[PDB]
Amino acid sequence: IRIRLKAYDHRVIDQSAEKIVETAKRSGADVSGPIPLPTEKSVYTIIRAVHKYKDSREQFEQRTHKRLIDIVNPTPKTVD
Amino acid sequence: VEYRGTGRRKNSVARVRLVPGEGNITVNNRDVREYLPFESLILDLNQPFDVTETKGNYDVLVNVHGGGFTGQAQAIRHGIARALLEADPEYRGSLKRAGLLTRDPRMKERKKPGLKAARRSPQFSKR
Amino acid sequence: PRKGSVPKRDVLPDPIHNSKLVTKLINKIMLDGKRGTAQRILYSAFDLVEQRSGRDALEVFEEAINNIMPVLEVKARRVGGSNYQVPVEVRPERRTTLGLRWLVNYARLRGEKTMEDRLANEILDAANNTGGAVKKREDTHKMAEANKAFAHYRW
Amino acid sequence: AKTSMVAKQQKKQKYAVREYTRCERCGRPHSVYRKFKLCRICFRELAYKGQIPGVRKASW
Amino acid sequence: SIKKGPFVDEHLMKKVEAQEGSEKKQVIKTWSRRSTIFPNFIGHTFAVYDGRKHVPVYVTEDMVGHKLGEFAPTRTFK
Amino acid sequence: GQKINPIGLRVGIIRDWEAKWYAEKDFASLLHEDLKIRKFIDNELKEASVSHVEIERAANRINIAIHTGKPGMVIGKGGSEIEKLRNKLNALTDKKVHINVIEIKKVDLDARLVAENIARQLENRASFRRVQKQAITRAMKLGAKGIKTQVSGRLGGADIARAEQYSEGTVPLHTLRADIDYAHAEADTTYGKLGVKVWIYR
RNA sequence: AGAACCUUACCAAAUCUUGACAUCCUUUGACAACUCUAGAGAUAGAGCCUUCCCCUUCGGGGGACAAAGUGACAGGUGGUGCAUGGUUGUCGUCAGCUCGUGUCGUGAGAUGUUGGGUUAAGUCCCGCAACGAGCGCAACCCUUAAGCUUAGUUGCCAUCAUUAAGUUGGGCACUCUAAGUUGACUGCCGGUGACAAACCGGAGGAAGGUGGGGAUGACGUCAAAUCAUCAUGCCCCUUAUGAUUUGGGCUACACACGUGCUACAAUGGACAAUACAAAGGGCAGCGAAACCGCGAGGUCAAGCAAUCCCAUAAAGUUGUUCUCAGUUCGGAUUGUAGUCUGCAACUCGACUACAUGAAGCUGGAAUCGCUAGUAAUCGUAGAUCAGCAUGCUACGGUGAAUACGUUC
Numbered sequence A: 001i002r003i004r005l006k007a008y009d010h011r012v013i014d015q016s017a018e019k020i021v022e023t024a025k026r027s028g029a030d031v032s033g034p035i036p037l038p039t040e041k042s043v044y045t046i047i048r049a050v051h052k053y054k055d056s057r058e059q060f061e062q063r064t065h066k067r068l069i070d071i072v073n074p075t076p077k078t079v080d
Numbered sequence B: 001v002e003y004r005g006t007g008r009r010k011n012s013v014a015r016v017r018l019v020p021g022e023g024n025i026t027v028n029n030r031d032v033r034e035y036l037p038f039e040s041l042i043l044d045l046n047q048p049f050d051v052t053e054t055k056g057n058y059d060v061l062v063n064v065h066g067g068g069f070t071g072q073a074q075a076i077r078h079g080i081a082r083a084l085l086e087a088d089p090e091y092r093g094s095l096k097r098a099g100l101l102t103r104d105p106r107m108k109e110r111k112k113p114g115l116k117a118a119r120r121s122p123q124f125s126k127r
Numbered sequence C: 001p002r003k004g005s006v007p008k009r010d011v012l013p014d015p016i017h018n019s020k021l022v023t024k025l026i027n028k029i030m031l032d033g034k035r036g037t038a039q040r041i042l043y044s045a046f047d048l049v050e051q052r053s054g055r056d057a058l059e060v061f062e063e064a065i066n067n068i069m070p071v072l073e074v075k076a077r078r079v080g081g082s083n084y085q086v087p088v089e090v091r092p093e094r095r096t097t098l099g100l101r102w103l104v105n106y107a108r109l110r111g112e113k114t115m116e117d118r119l120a121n122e123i124l125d126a127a128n129n130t131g132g133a134v135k136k137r138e139d140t141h142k143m144a145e146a147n148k149a150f151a152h153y154r155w
Numbered sequence D: 001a002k003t004s005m006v007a008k009q010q011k012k013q014k015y016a017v018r019e020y021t022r023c024e025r026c027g028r029p030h031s032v033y034r035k036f037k038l039c040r041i042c043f044r045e046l047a048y049k050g051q052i053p054g055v056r057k058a059s060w
Numbered sequence E: 001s002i003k004k005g006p007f008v009d010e011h012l013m014k015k016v017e018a019q020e021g022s023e024k025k026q027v028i029k030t031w032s033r034r035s036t037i038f039p040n041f042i043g044h045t046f047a048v049y050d051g052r053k054h055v056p057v058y059v060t061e062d063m064v065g066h067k068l069g070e071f072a073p074t075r076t077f078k
Numbered sequence F: 001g002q003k004i005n006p007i008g009l010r011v012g013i014i015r016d017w018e019a020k021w022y023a024e025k026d027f028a029s030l031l032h033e034d035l036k037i038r039k040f041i042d043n044e045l046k047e048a049s050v051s052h053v054e055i056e057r058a059a060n061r062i063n064i065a066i067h068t069g070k071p072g073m074v075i076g077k078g079g080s081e082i083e084k085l086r087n088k089l090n091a092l093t094d095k096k097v098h099i100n101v102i103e104i105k106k107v108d109l110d111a112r113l114v115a116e117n118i119a120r121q122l123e124n125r126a127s128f129r130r131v132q133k134q135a136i137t138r139a140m141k142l143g144a145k146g147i148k149t150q151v152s153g154r155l156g157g158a159d160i161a162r163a164e165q166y167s168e169g170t171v172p173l174h175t176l177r178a179d180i181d182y183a184h185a186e187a188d189t190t191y192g193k194l195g196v197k198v199w200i201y202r
Numbered sequence G: 001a002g003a004a005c006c007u008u009a010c011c012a013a014a015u016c017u018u019g020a021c022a023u024c025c026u027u028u029g030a031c032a033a034c035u036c037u038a039g040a041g042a043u044a045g046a047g048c049c050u051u052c053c054c055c056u057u058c059g060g061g062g063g064a065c066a067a068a069g070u071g072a073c074a075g076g077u078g079g080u081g082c083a084u085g086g087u088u089g090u091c092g093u094c095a096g097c098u099c100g101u102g103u104c105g106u107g108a109g110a111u112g113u114u115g116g117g118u119u120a121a122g123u124c125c126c127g128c129a130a131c132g133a134g135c136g137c138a139a140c141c142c143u144u145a146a147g148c149u150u151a152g153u154u155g156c157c158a159u160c161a162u163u164a165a166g167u168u169g170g171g172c173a174c175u176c177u178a179a180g181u182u183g184a185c186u187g188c189c190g191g192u193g194a195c196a197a198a199c200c201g202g203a204g205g206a207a208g209g210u211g212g213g214g215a216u217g218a219c220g221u222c223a224a225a226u227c228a229u230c231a232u233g234c235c236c237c238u239u240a241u242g243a244u245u246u247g248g249g250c251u252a253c254a255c256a257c258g259u260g261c262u263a264c265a266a267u268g269g270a271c272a273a274u275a276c277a278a279a280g281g282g283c284a285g286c287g288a289a290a291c292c293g294c295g296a297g298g299u300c301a302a303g304c305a306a307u308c309c310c311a312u313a314a315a316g317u318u319g320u321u322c323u324c325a326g327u328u329c330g331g332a333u334u335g336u337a338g339u340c341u342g343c344a345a346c347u348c349g350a351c352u353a354c355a356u357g358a359a360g361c362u363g364g365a366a367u368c369g370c371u372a373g374u375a376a377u378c379g380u381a382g383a384u385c386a387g388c389a390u391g392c393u394a395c396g397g398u399g400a401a402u403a404c405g406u407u408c
């Protein structure tokens, strides 16, 4: 079915991935081991000061982590 | 018997194999001598073959990826040394006597914020 | 560097000419990061030596550096509470590196209207004397060799 | 004279592209964003103390 | 400068297209410095500036294709 | 020359965030929504020892958590005022589900309500050095291992301003590991403005 | 980190002064959401459905969309960073700065921080009225540098086979790969510094002696900067030092100086052919393929977040040609004829082909920037943004010369 997960923190998404593969593997389901898609950042380089004292700046990021999980056996014990 | 010689130089991977016979190097279903575009010194990546006391040991039919062209080159030079030492494990004490097998000294670096070319500073006027 | 002796570690092999001291003057004609236009011009300026000179450029080449080879340096030093010059003989690693600039700086000065022919008239006419750049090494060769002065100075 | 301007901007003076974008908790008309609708100094005290998501510091 | 109707402002057209009846001369009072010259223009002035000027500009048979009432300048130099 | 505020660096390795939710497109107006409601706690409760609120969103199931330290008077008469701002904040758009308080014993071991303990004194003109030094000395009779308090703007009835930091203990600012809890409070009465900063270790 | 109008605080013309705004006030129609009159517009008026909530048993919290004149008033991008809070620039990532007990001094004060040696370092040991502590440097944190688990669908294909190539199957799973782990530290090292830490050497981790970079900015100075981000003590404006449009301005000009770009040519130009990246964005946005245009583009139009799109990187290679010239160098300037964004491009954008083709021969006195993926070279992407950057912060490709020395 290939459910997708994406989250800001990085340990949270691995414990969620092992939660969903735990609730899938404890029932009969031939699920793949969870897939790391590359995790994308984006950059916010910004001026610190309030007036015109430029050429003194600092940057920010935010980093979305993207995993991937797919099941190929729709069973009644793996429904939701 | 030699396989899986990875090779890295400046953001340009290269994976190889080594087949016995004679020295015949080839990448990406086309030649080498008229692929490395300027690079008249094609022989100077074959130069570990020069210093391993034997030139025509094996054939390669190698693979390469990414980077520039000499950034895409010169890692084949690195990449056949790992599999070359995996062909016979004697050569670490006898290929690192010219110091050749592995060094990853340098890649490009960050443009420092409020500068122009990552070590250069803009010109300040006077006093 | 007040800390001492940054290492050298520079290497210079070559494809055909079998000489470390020929890949140096490919590294000084190469301006603006274009190594992809140097030996295309250099090796097309050495294969035109034997068509212009009498011989192959190999046995002319060590003569061509040999006659241009600078001898003496004048590194000024304010001695002991005074101020005038001193002759210094160059350590043998530095002297070729000082030496090779005078090929290329006068290569861009001989108006022959073809750089792979204008530059090669200073390897021809360099094994033979009174070239373009031999005039400067004889001008500075007698800078303090004849003008010998306080030669007990340190630096 | 800017609290009149915010009274203009959330209304509409009817042409297509006469509007512009202003800071949410502050009121600057320049260097604002569209990911946040904040602005370049008013973003910074709200990027600190953890209260906005996403934002680690720097230095990748 | 494109195709499709060189963009006379329409209220100016409302004034001129029925203003051209008699032999009277009361010209514009516009201060809309945007419109081009439709070819059916009668002898009249205009008032084309709004900071402080009503410069009466001639409608005389110039190159009428200009997309501007720009015969009235804005500032001085010396 | 500038000490940057130590909460800024110390997120993502030892202190987590304040808004756990994720968004994709609504992050503009949703980022206006939480930043709209995170003043109403400090205004409506009027600081019943309220440290800092917590947002999490779960797709039309919001959950917010106010620490606030002091139970009881935050709640109302057994459950009266809590639903009164459930109803009051539920008129924001369609929100305010499961607000809960988590009390704080060891009162003056946390930066905020210390800074409103000693901002609230000197705005009633309580002679700043006994304002600070007691809030210093209660820290290390309650087990703390570092506090630095500074008060800056125009102390006393003077006409030039000078900052008088009265620190002690151990208060590092170049180790990332420690949970340097920071606060700030700007409060002054009838003779200008004034700033107050408090760093607390542990 | 976007000036056509908007922005916009400036000024000129019309324009109201419980107000374009926020609060209550008394009864509640909602709309000016539409069609028309005038005007440039704000607005000035007429046609409205002149309604509606949420539940009472003829009834009120007043939610609407805001309506009536009041008062409490509101509004200030107006004065000042020498009344301030917050926030930065800097000396300078320099290696210093301070206490708490003592103890000398009538005391301002000093020891502790000094004298031996080492280190980038007040880092380190050996000494001694000092013994310790605290803020600093170091590690802790990101990024990169090589393996093993653990995963595999868009992730790669060789071992097999149809493959223009869709990587279609095989389900192959290793090879990068993409985010989660083992281990660098002066370690056993040879010296000899005489045991003082440490310093020059040899070994084997891919790895040098803080592996390479960032983020981190001590007490404090400069009454440095900001009331125009916001907050703000106090003084002024009070049918105008407020408010709303339209339309000018912020770009004007003999001039003076900063920064940036593109060039003066033949290791250069034109011309067709011809390979190899990283980092990014795109659900009314990115837009393919094939289509009509000299191009700027126009229509339609499937696929869509590693997979799909923008998106050909460019420099260089092989080859043709101009053959050393105010020139087949350069496009500065200047009219016609378009495209696109927009309600509109005159003041005041941008791009294309048609001719026009100026200045200029590597620049006086002087003056900067850089120590290995580094300066230089052509390029790639992004935010800001409808449209418009040579700036800006990010990313790869090609890649040298030089540092014996501390005298100035």
Ligand SMILES: [Mg+2]
Binding pocket: B004, G174, G175
């Ligand atoms: Mg392998």
Ligand SMILES: [Mg+2]
Binding pocket: C002, C003, C004
């Ligand atoms: Mg030294």
Ligand SMILES: [Mg+2]
Binding pocket: D003
């Ligand atoms: Mg105001």
Ligand SMILES: [Mg+2]
Binding pocket: none
């Ligand atoms: Mg490291």
Ligand SMILES: [Mg+2]
Binding pocket: none
């Ligand atoms: Mg480092």
Ligand SMILES: [Mg+2]
Binding pocket: F174
């Ligand atoms: Mg540090």
Ligand SMILES: [Mg+2]
Binding pocket: none
């Ligand atoms: Mg004011």
Ligand SMILES: [Mg+2]
Binding pocket: G250
């Ligand atoms: Mg300006």
Ligand SMILES: [Mg+2]
Binding pocket: G311
């Ligand atoms: Mg394409």
